[PDB]
Amino acid sequence: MVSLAQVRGALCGALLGDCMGAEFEGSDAVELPDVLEFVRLLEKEKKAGTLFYTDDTAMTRAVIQSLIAKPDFDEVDMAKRFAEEYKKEPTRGYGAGVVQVFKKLLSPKYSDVFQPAREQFDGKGSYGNGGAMRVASIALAYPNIQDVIKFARRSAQLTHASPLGYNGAILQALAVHFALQGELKRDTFLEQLIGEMERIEGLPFCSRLKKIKEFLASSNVPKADIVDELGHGIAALESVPTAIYSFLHCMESDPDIPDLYNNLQRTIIYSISLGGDTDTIATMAGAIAGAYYGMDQVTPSWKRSCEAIVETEESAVKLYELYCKQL
């Protein structure tokens, strides 16, 4: 079964990904030398908590507080927490679309908490990665895969009504789910994901998962190819597969990252190096890596730099107890 180290690892990895990623958000300019330089500077900063979190963590904290409060999953409670969190701290770096959902949820006009999301972008719904960026904790709370799928979907559908948005969230939740389940081989991990997403989609996400397989069978794949084929975007389709690739790639040495950085550190460094939506791709790859390698790879020097590290650790313990209760 899942250990405390794994739940702690997942959440801290997600926080690190968000906080460190934020440095480089929306940049066509990022290459690995800058990330390594940034990390060296980070690891000798005298003050703790210099890196502030973004919408990624803010929404993550709301998910977690909903699961703890309503462990059978209460989407009305979760929507309320998203909307109140936004209201309290609107400048955290939210999507331009999703702001309209929060205001609609805060008004007394909607009895149906899914309806604001359905109305997004001319009724097509958002295909953004905001559903996925906050979903890891679903997989940390619910052992059963069928729960992980349905609750990933519903948590996502509060903001992301498009199949790309909510299926992106399911994929990210499944990636954490399967990373939790033993030191599972690379090839087993992927088989599991492709299997599930083929059933769920039918295939955009499956297509990208197959590309990941291809890339992982080659060596020294340029980052240009990864960005071209997988993306580094705010779209779920162009970020969730990318996060998964970053996790899988960094299970082995990358010749450009010193091997004195552990696998989780490597994963975060590599993720950020891909550019674009650096906070979300790194928060997602970091959640998966955290679940896989556990808290042993979340180094004191790194975690101390993050806003809300203590609260995050505390919430990991609470999530672990929820998980244990569900067995």
> Interface residues with Mg ion (CB under 5 A)?
54-56, 93, 279
Does residue 97 touch ligand A3R according to CB under 6 A? yes
Does residue 280 touch ligand A3R according to CB under 6 A? yes
Part of the chain binding ligand A3R (CB under 6 A), chosen from 15-23, 91-99, 185-193, 206-214:
91-99
Please, what is the minimum distance in Å from the beta carbon of residue 226 to ligand A3R? 19
Buried b (16+ CB within 10 A) or exposed e, 69-93: eeeebebebbbbbbbebbeeeeebb
Does residue 275 touch ligand A3R according to CB under 6 A? no
Q: How far is CA 172 from CA 79, 146, 267, in A?
A: 20, 14, 15
Please, what is the minimum distance in Å from the beta carbon of residue 264 to Mg ion? 19
Three-state SS string across 96-152, please?
CCHHHHHHHHHCCCCCCCCHHHHHHHHHCCCCECHHHHCCHHHHHHCCCHHHHHHHH
d(CA 166, CA 124) in angstroms, rounded, equals: 12
Residue 26, classed as helix, strand or coil, is: coil
DSSP character string of 262-291: -HHHHHHHHHHHT-BSHHHHHHHHHHHHHH
d(CA 228, CA 216) in angstroms, rounded, equals: 15
Please, what is the minimum distance in Å from the beta carbon of residue 129 to ligand A3R? 5
**Is 25 marked as binding a ligand?**
yes
- Give the nearer residue to ligand A3R in terms of CB position, either 129 or 246: 129
Please, what is the minimum distance in Å from the beta carbon of residue 124 to ligand A3R? 5
Q: How far is CA 208 from CA 37, 214, 281, in A?
A: 31, 10, 15
Read off the DSSP letter of residue 296: G
Q: Which does 95 bind (CB under 5 to 8 A by kind): Mg ion, ligand A3R, none?
A: ligand A3R
- Give the nearer residue to ligand A3R in terms of CB position, either 127 or 151: 127
- Give the nearer residue to ligand A3R in terms of CB position, either 128 or 290: 128
d(CA 251, CA 323) in angstroms, rounded, equals: 26
Out of 9, 21, 95, 116, the only residue in the binding site for ligand A3R (CB under 6 A) is: 95
**Is 187 marked as binding a ligand?**
no
Interacting residues with ligand A3R between 31 and 90 (CB under 6 A): 55
**Is 253 marked as binding a ligand?**
no
Part of the chain binding ligand A3R (CB under 6 A), chosen from 96-104, 149-157, 263-271, 308-316:
96-104
d(CA 216, CA 245) in angstroms, rounded, equals: 8
DSSP character string of 51-65: BPP-HHHHHHHHHHH
Part of the chain binding ligand A3R (CB under 6 A), chosen from 64-72, 108-116, 122-130, 224-232:
122-130
Please, what is the minimum distance in Å from the beta carbon of residue 166 to ligand A3R? 11
**Is 299 marked as binding a ligand?**
no
Nearest Cα residue to 117 out of 87, 79, 72, 74: 79
Out of 41, 121, 195, 310, the only residue in the binding site for ligand A3R (CB under 6 A) is: 121
Residues annotated within the binding site for substrate are 55, 124-130, 160, 234
Residues annotated within the binding site for Mg(2+) are 18, 25, 54-56, 277, 279-280
| Binding residues vs ligand A3R (CB under 6 A) | 55, 93-98, 121, 124, 126-130, 159, 162, 234, 277, 280
Residues annotated within the binding site are 18, 25, 54-56, 124-130, 160, 234, 277, 279-280
